[model samples]
Target: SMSYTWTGALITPCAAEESKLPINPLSNSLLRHHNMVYATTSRSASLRQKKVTFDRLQVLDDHYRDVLKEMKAKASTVKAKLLSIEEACKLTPPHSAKSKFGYGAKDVRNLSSRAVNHIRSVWEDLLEDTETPIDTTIMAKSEVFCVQPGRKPARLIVFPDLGVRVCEKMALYDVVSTLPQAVMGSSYGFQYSPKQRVEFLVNTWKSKKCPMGFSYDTRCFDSTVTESDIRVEESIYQCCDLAPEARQAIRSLTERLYIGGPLTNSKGQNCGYRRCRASGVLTTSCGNTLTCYLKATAACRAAKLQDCTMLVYGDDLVVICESAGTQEDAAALRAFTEAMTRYSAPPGDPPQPEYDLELITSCSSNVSVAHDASGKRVYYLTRDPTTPLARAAWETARHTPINSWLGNIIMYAPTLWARMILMTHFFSILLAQEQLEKALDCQIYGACYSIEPLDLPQIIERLHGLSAFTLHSYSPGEINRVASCLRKLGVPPLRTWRHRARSVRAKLLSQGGRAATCGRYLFNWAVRTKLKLTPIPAASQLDLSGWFVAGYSGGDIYH
Candidate 1:
């Protein structure tokens, strides 16, 4: 079975004068600590005496140095730009007309919309092209398979043919979004501020059981309910009094809806069941009676009173009624209730919150009001087992032609170097896997790999070669030359090259590529007679680092 481990790299801006930064200082330290602890505890001579292989260490060192070089160049450019802006600032008067009109020098640091858009585009492009690294150190042999682990793991790995690819994309997105802060202190900026905020709202809605669908804000909402008159009691009653048809319409249109009920765990203690309830009741010290009333009214108005349940403990609203609905519905309700609750809070208070108004608006705009194309509502892409797009995106992901989806994180926030690092690591691993297979003379079945360290040049070269091979047949001499070229480039050699040659020739012959088969039989016979290693399996677990050795020697190739 294939197992995966993630490694992250942090990409950040640096000055040209700055020295090369470490790849992952935390990971390096951890490895060093592990070695120290292993040396202290392990008694086995081979295990204790074992040193880190040069291939593995070199992968890290080379990646770190290369990234640092790139960062230095980027940082120097950014610094120069910043200096120009500073000079511009100095030239302008403190209270000049431009300053007063908000087009002043201070705006330079604000990151213009154009600049943000450009950065976001670049970030997205890079991530899509980049491959994330994955560690397969402890992976065991099994039929080819990939499984994503998490709540939506199955969804992510739905396209088994593209499972590995999707995972790589996701891994890259994760690293690009997180790693910068882990290494340095900042990352690039993008126009993803609104998107991030929207995601947070969606998450919050999912946490709550609010009934309102995703919306940016309800412009059609009656403004007669003034700020001063926006009482909690009134809001609660209005929410409860919503007509059944209106509720149904809202529920059907919205991806999320709130249903109120008593919050209680399996043991029946007053536990804040979800984020919305906790934030509204427990944190706000709203008593149980009010919470129950709010829930009952909301449920009754929504025609889901029976579905709502509550748990009471003394006079305090330990757990209000829980909302029962689809995941999206639940998210919607949570957003609504949370919004109302916050809106009712006293002015000048610290807990001034923003709601998923954008979601609600987007979801209900067509039905409730009107909007332009730019503000068009979007619904969740429903899971379909039949559609080709769905099949290609999900089912086919389970097997063959591995591919991954790289998210547009950098497009939103360039400061996430730590996240990018994790992505790079995944890509590096993939690159290493491809390099290994090429060295071994054939595609190793049931094995998948991704690139880490995100070496753009090497990846481009390997891809170019693979594309060339796929388009035309290579003579035995040409194949040998290709192998030699890879070797010169520091790619590892395959252990059973002769056997691989035979297998390739047979495959080509079956496909009517007769010219490719002439030298394969001779190679196979030589391997059987001289090498004396029987062909064991079409695919087998092999240590990638072991293939990096300079010479064919002991079975333990990399000492």
Candidate 2:
């Protein structure tokens, strides 16, 4: 669905030297690749979506009925307890996005009277009136130009104000966390770790004598929501039992806010309407999961695809089915496209089923070849660490709010890049602050999670399957990008990073107990003389389950 346009010989981001004054790491890489035009989407496709927005494509066949029936039953059993205003306030992180009420997260966490009253007012307002439409601000988000790198473009994304975001957390965070798994079961994409996800992929392959797996790209999926789809989503919510007042609040919230909101662009232009999921809302995740599961399951039957199972995370959909050969693959994919089109979710890139278990790419993580502790090859999920590391280098030099580098180090513990670069940089900075014992928030697969140094080993094992620590062999592309990033970011080269890791390693071991073990286990590659391991106490019950491993699960609730 995407390609690049390669250009001329003047290799630089700027026409003048002074233009490169500030050290912008990511944009610098594209300086050399200035001629390549890379796009996963196109302008033509935007117009292709014009005719399909309200096509009434949803098929309520027995398959869909069966799935919906099961969903309704599962939802009924969701008996989640809402967090009290104080309890909810406590859950608010010290580094959480600031509230519009002239207060920061620290004020909220400290139970400041102003913050508490404002939060309560937002909740009560939701209960009092559901008809007032909430306004959302739209911003264009840009990531590092990774494909062919010729300067990246920002895509428009919309979300509500801080007050609404806080309101969402109060009302729906618990439901978002728990209710989906109950309804969709194994189909819920948030319930699995990377290891478990890989296991599922392999299991499905083995389950079919001839299995084929392919992912579909939906074109601007968030913009594809119709009034009917929103209504159906609301019906799914209604299936759940809730406190009466809570029910009214949710209903009001849905009618006024969730369904659709007015959009304004970065330049203050009234872009007008958005009938789809607001990317910033709490329901964006579960809502997409529910809608996709509903449409895809029915489409599988319509297409006559056998043993069809799908895992969806946002717009990314991976479906595995029997390989009745290329012809069947074509038919099944077309059926999927047709079904989703009817469901108002058009395909961006039609399903492309073309690989073995060795190549799994989900959540921007692909199965990469790396060596475990003993120099044997193993496959684990990782991508080029350039972007994250570039950001890490940025944070290291600046006073930032979150320890993103530390989080990536914990989550991708065994990756050669994380072990050598991210780990080294993060611990060095932590030692610089004498805050190695302090817990910090970091992002993993787009979700925010907190971690401690003592929890590193166990966290790695759970999320990256411990091979993250034992793994090595960073790719040449990954190596080149990291080098380029360091040069661009004005950070020291990899040669010096080794010394820093060694320095950080000694400090870690000197601390005694678990942090010492974590240092040795994680930074074993740093020192020739490795530290012997200590047991991660009661490691089994440690609840490493809340991993943002960027995956999900199975179902049981009925009358």
TM-score: which candidate is best?
A: 2
Estimate every model's Cα lDDT from 0 to 1: 0.23, 0.62
Point out where model 1 deviates above 4 Å: 1-246, 249-259, 266-413, 416-420, 433-559
Cα RMSD of all models vs. native, in order, equals 30.6, 7.8
Give a tens-digit lDDT track for model 2, residues 1-559.
Answer: 0111112111112111111122444323222332121222222223322432332344355776776777788898887656577666665556655665698778877888888778778888889987888776554332222333243334444566555566666676667777778877776666777677666766776788887777767676666665566677777777776767667767887888777766554344454555666666767777777877887777787788778778777666777788778887788779877877776667866666654644545556665566766788765566656566545644544444556677667656656667777777666666666776776666554455566766777777656565566555766755676677656544567777678788888888898887677677778777766554444554555775556422211000000
- The stretch of ten residues in a row with the least summed lDDT in candidate 2 is 550-559
Clashes within 3 Å, all models in order: 102, 13
- Candidate 1 residues 1-559, lDDT tens each? 0011112111111222111112233323111111111101111212211220011100112322343344333323221011122232232222211211134322423445543343334334333432221111110111211111211101000011111122222212222222222222211111112233234334434555552332112111111112122132222222322333322322221111012222322222332211111111111111122322232233223333222222211111111123454554455444434433332311122121223333232211111111212344322111111111111222112322322222111111111111122122222333334431231111111112332222222221221211111111223433464345324322223333333444543443354322222222212232333222222221133233412111111001011
RMSD of candidate 1 to true structure, Å: 30.6
The true-versus-predicted C-alpha distance at residue 189 of model 2, in Å, is 2.4
